[PDB]
Amino acid sequence: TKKPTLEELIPGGESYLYAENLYGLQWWGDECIKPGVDTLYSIQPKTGKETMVITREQINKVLEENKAGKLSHLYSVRFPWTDKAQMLFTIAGKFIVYNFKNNQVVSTFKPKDGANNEDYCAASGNVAYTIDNNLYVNEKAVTNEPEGIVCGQTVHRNEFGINKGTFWSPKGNLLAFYRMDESMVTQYPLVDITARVGEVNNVRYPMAGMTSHQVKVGIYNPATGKSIYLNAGDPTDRYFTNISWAPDEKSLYLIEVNRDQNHAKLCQYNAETGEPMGVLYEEMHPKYVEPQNPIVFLPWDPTKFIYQSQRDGYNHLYLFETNAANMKGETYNSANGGSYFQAGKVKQLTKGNWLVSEILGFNTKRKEVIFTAVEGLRSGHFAVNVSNGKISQPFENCKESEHSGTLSASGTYLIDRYSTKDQPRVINLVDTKNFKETANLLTAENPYDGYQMPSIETGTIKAADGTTDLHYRLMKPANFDPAKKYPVIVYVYGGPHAQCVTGGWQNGARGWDTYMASKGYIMFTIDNRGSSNRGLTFENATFRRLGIEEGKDQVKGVEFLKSLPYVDSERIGVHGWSFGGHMTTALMLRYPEIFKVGVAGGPVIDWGYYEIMYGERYMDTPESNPEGYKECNLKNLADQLKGHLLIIHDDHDDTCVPQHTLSFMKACVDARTYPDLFIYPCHKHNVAGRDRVHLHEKITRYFEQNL
Amino acid sequence: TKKPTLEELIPGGESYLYAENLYGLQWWGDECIKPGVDTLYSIQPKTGKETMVITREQINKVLEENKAGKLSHLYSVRFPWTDKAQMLFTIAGKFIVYNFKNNQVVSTFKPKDGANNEDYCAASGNVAYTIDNNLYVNEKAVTNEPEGIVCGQTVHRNEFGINKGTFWSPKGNLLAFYRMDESMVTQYPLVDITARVGEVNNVRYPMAGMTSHQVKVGIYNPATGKSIYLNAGDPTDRYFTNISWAPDEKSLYLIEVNRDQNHAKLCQYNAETGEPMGVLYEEMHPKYVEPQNPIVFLPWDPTKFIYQSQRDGYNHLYLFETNAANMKGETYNSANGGSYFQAGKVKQLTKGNWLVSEILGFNTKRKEVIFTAVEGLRSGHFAVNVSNGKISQPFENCKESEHSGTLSASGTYLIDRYSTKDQPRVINLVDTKNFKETANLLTAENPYDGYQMPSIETGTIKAADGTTDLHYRLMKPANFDPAKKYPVIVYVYGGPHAQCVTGGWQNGARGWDTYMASKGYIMFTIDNRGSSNRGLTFENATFRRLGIEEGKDQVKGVEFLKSLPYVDSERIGVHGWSFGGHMTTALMLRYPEIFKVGVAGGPVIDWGYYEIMYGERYMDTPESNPEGYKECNLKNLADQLKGHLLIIHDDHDDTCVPQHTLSFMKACVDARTYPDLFIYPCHKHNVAGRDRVHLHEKITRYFEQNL
Ligand SMILES: [Mg+2]
Ligand SMILES: [Mg+2]
């Protein structure tokens, strides 16, 4: 009979309910380490037998004898040496290497104050980290650059799979790093209203069609203290992505992407001189090419590497030869409608209407690559023999689930974390020879046990093309009566790189979904064309017209709801954030007779205010696609607003500048339409922490008053 | 049966209704000039006989012979020479002097492009004007100052009656001007969201308790082209106000006010050297002193001048001696609780529980000063003989009305513009010997003739002190039934320098008052203690605690409404702008059991964000009044919000920085209270033009949905 509140359903809530977990669970060679608050256990994967390693009292005793501090829990320890009985942890910025068979502090190192993006190399003992805009290795500064130059940090606004800007050589003798010059990029003025006098907080923001930032790759030698830069030419309008090292540390590889994002090149550079050594492979597509993963060399054969490509329509593994730049190249057409320039023998290791979501690593003894594969609501772990191409089992044996994995040092065992509709969290140890569970580490209990909960249903309907199958999730209140009429709220995202309907826990339902469904509102979400884990054809159907085919598919979802007799067709609302915010506004403006109430958070209004990297991939430039930009500029449709639309924007949003929403307000004032607005001061793109509860109460209140 | 629309009732509306007027009505000596679109007439004041002077066709004929352009109407013509049959007008920035007896162009002058604040001196033919931050006289630049220096323009944020920064000598041979250095004042970042990339639009804004701007007075001679600056010492934390010239042009007078605004000094300076020549008079008050008018010399005796002071509790005329600085000074206590340092014989020309609102000028033959006097809803024109102090008639003969006047060159006749509850606009010529109407120039007809209109009632109730009488205005729908219950909307301002309930047209009702009253809402407004035209005691009751006594008085108004059987006590809303926005928020937070719904526009939230000049006058400094600032900081009461509060703020508001409202939103998020917000981009303190209709539709909609 008791229903959960927003305090129990929204992250940031005082009593937020979540399924039990095993934090810090990792590998020490081929032994599984299960940390706790007071003990660290070792688990033999073959048997599942738990052996105690060390207690926090024991470690703290030795830390106090060294005046090194105190641990509160053992969840943050790491085991980066397969052969040394050593542990690594941090206590107030200080790195401690601890021997757990002798109970001794091996070493301590404290980087300079204000250290971020710390990247430790176990093989050499070197640590790279950043202080403001400059890069540091151990006690020395690698760079001394002015404002506008950023070193050793992420570049190209985290696109093409870039998440860091430091790349240690396999043995830790050289460090590759990014050097970004943003000096020529426009600054957007955010205003801090908590200062004595409201101050400007400028952020570099490159908008579609304007001047971009320039990236350079440096190579630093900690033994000499000298750095070189790769001689790639004028870096203007070029992306330098997916940095990878040769196993011998003599050359560096990267994937270069042009500004039009339709041509990618796998390049080699000399690590000692920075001189180019050739192009091994080239990939082209009339729409776009999007490299997201570096090349991985075979641990048993450095003359071969695995490249990840969607050229046939799905992300798959391809085995290439290292000597490809010095062989005869031929041009080929690819199944995705693109083309590629390839030399040498290339072997497609994985094939089918599914994609590889992660390379987990290798089993060197059995010569296999272990990986995770996905499609729609299905996921699973797999192995493929690199020599013959024999796959462990067909993708068709996959169930609806969400799998995550961590491979042991020998590739013999796997930590398998998964969730299904009714199973919140299951953690098993899995044998990679036959993919059989060897031991259950956790089977989390339902955190909503003893609460009244809504029902969840998933299914498929056809897209606006009449052929593509779209997955939807439908939620109803617990006391649902099919004789009564109910209001509906469509939760929408619908942009690329995301999927709302999963095969995981509650089919991806969010806390607010649960909250509104229990308040008497039917909740609906459909994953339209453009969304992820369905291949490139499903995704690029939206090219140069973002939001259009997405809206058409969302309307097919509504036509399905209207066919249900318990749906009140005159009470359809819509809510989304970011791309979802654009979709909420666009649906209100393009289908004003369908959607009655809408709540749009941090939306994109005009793609001309959006970043170059993401924007120009799907929309090209305002100069190259003037029709696309006009059609998808929601300021042009401001006069179509009939219903209740609330726009929420955060004052320190540097993903969607606040200009989007205020320029939309001005357009409605001029057109004499009446949207509502709300600004969350001191919040970035999303409202985080306790204020996220305030946000969901405000959203709930808007739908209760107007739907 | 037809009701007016917001398009007919709101300025900026497409069909805005207003009472007929006579634009450009002025004096050519003692002849009254009535311009029109096609003709200029002359009116003999004794008789009221209209004589044609000239036609637009005649003037345009002569302008075309001189290639000087074309006039579209004769409303912008001026007659600054009493003895020359000449006119002044401007065609596309070009000044033209025209003789209307001979039909000849006398001269043309075109100032540099981008000219503003043009100040023409008919006696010398010189014109001063500004281009950006610099001052110009005729063809030459007086100043060449960098960013942060402003010359020849208004200073001290238009306080102490400063409305310009150029002051010509009586014969036009010297120009006194302001030079303001703002370089040391903090810049507030406003953001222009119409730019390609949202840009910063900085404004200098000095906040209470912080570093102020510095003002200097320059004296420029157009014949020599040289300037001198008054040697007043370090200008830090001093106000230089009410600049006035000696009749012989040999010295300049000003009133200096300290930063604590409790000590004023009448000062003389040599016009040739800029050297100080003494202090003639000093005025002190424990609360504040506020000089707002320069001294005026008697046209028949330059050894005497009239000073305007509230030292006895009401603004009155005092006759002083020019030789006062060189006489024996004594300190005296004043009836307002202040003190003054005075030398020589001083004569109080006007006395009573009423104030002088304007010195219209003089009748030199009869030795009288003509002036307008006000108190509450009462107004009138008066003469006092400067020699014997005999007043034309007692203030008690005044009726409820709003009078405005323009005196002829000899002070024999007056243009009297007035309004009463039911008379929208009456314009008469009045004989200043007996103040009898000599001719009716206009008796405007009601612009709402043929419309359904609400009823208007005025009365008085006692203030929260139990002794002071407060004027209120009550409006009811036309079909009002005293058997039914009605919702009420309190319109509030309540700050100093303003009065809402007048003796003029509709007792000061505004368009939106009319609109809501006709929609079935009772409208109520009360002029609380702190408001103007009631003397200093009524006003400074709020000193150091702005909003507190004002709220108490607004609540006495509500206790009156609750005593009316046709008022629904459970449906009371409130609306105000600026000080009224503060009042709306404060009333919602301090009396949450009284006001159900509120709409606050461009409010003051924290007095620490408000300007030095106005703020420190009534609140002192945050360091001098920490309790006052804490109590009146509405962020401190954020947790008290129970009802529906909408805060509207304009993104380019440089009166109330947008920081006020955004810092209030943050405080409510933190306190878990739910106010609503709206931002009008590209609007200053008030929404002007067609968007003002959008603003009033949004305000109407908020009250219809929630009250
Ligand atoms: Mg492109
Ligand atoms: Mg003071």
GROMACS .gro file of C-alpha atoms and ligand atoms in nm, chain A residues 259-262 286-288 543 616-617 620, ligand 1:
model
   12
  259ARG     CA    1   3.611   1.856  -4.029
  260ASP     CA    2   3.342   1.714  -4.263
  261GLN     CA    3   3.368   1.389  -4.056
  262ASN     CA    4   3.330   1.165  -4.365
  286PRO     CA    5   2.891   1.009  -4.770
  287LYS     CA    6   2.717   1.089  -4.432
  288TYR     CA    7   2.976   1.033  -4.156
  543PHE     CA    8   2.122   1.278  -4.116
  616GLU     CA    9   2.845   1.905  -3.777
  617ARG     CA   10   2.851   1.526  -3.765
  620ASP     CA   11   2.689   1.934  -4.157
 1415MG      MG   12   2.985   1.607  -4.290
   0.00000   0.00000   0.00000
